[PDB]
Ligand binder design. Structure first.
Ligand SMILES: N[C@@H](CCC(=O)N[C@@H](CS(=O)(=O)O)C(=O)NCC(=O)O)C(=O)O
Ligand SMILES: N[C@@H](CCC(=O)N[C@@H](CS(=O)(=O)O)C(=O)NCC(=O)O)C(=O)O
Lengths: 201, 187
């Protein structure tokens, strides 16, 4: 099994989930500027959308979209409780968090990473992101994980995206619950192992 | 259940899904922070008083509640993760793609880029359709339909995208889709 990734990109969420799920895999880095692998091959021939992550299964299935990849992996190991069981309301609350992170935070940050984005527009995006972070910080008030006291694929995703707040230097003053969360997450061995393998830390 | 909706909005996907899943429910117009702190539609008020937000989450909760209808395939099937893949694509690449074309804070100068990125994604959607994921109707079809209505509304260039057009026609012929459109005062 192969994870197509870029160091520190959104694909880190799927990389963490792979480690939390106990699966062996191979990491393949993608140049997103040139849409090329290290071996020179055209990445568009693997994933036509040209984005990371993508997960290629042993049987040749290609899965794209981080949220789908992460549900596929969680559903494979129900004893790990990375996602509560089908039909259980806490499952769908976890799914609610995944979609919020996907649409409101992950895609909220994207315009800061693109060349086609007008410079003059960046201050608007940053201001929007700082308000969202106020909401996330409140949601984390209980200082454990985002859903309850179980670790889930939503935590892996939120952690991955919130790293970007530090990287672009948004104003995080007094967002203490985000701080506690990031600290709890960075202590997990499976997240330390993912960060090391991507060259982060 | 109550559905909190607005007629044209992303909430129509959740409303089709409720009709396709056989649920009884009430509609409630929104122009609300005391109900949903996010101030968005859709939101689905369950019978224990619990609120579920995020269309993608609502749709999966409903489809899973009626597995024999095959609105979403079972866990550990590849077809389930293909439907989930479409849901996320539509949410993050199409839906959020359109959203700038509505807000006031958005500069005119970002606009050509937004529309061109969207024209590009629609070429990809048209080729994928050459229902969206297999021979069965799913929640991904419901959401794609909802969001593509906006492509028509804001006059994106859909020239040559005949599989999209034929999809919009097949969707509008579904009785439960017609009833949902009808109940929201749309044609
Ligand atoms: N809808 C996709 C989005 C994936 C994402 O946007 N990929 C970025 C990397 S990241 O900015 O989100 O870290 C992309 O590959 N960039 C290249 C492509 O957009 O050209 C899914 O959620 O996985
Ligand atoms: N991440 C949310 C976003 C929901 C969506 O952004 N809702 C819009 C309406 S729509 O453009 O998707 O039809 C919201 O109510 N808008 C709040 C603002 O317009 O006041 C989920 O996907 O449902």
């Amino acid at each position: 099994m192969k994870l197509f990734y870029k160091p520190g990109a959104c694909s880190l969420a799927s990389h963490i989930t792979l480690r939390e799920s106990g699966k062996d895999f191979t990491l393949v880095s993608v140049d997103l500027m040139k849409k090329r692998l290290e071996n020179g091959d055209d990445y568009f021939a693997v994933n036509p959308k040209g984005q990371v992550p993508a997960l290629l299964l042993d049987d040749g299935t290609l899965l794209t979209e981080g949220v789908a990849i992460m549900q596929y992996l969680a559903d494979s190991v129900p004893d790990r409780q990375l996602l509560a069981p089908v039909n259980s309301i806490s499952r769908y609350k976890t799914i609610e968090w995944l979609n919020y992170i996907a649409t409101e935070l992950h895609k909220g940050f994207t315009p800061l990473f693109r060349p086609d984005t007008p410079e003059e527009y960046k201050p608007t995006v940053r201001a929007q992101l700082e308000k969202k972070l106020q909401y996330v910080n409140e949601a984390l008030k209980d200082e454990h994980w985002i859903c309850g006291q179980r670790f889930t694929i939503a935590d892996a995703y939120l952690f991955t995206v919130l790293r970007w707040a530090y990287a672009v230097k948004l104003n995080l003053e007094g967002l203490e619950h985000i701080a506690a969360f990031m600290q709890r997450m960075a202590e997990r061995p499976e997240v330390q192992d993912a960060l090391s393998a991507e060259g982060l830390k």
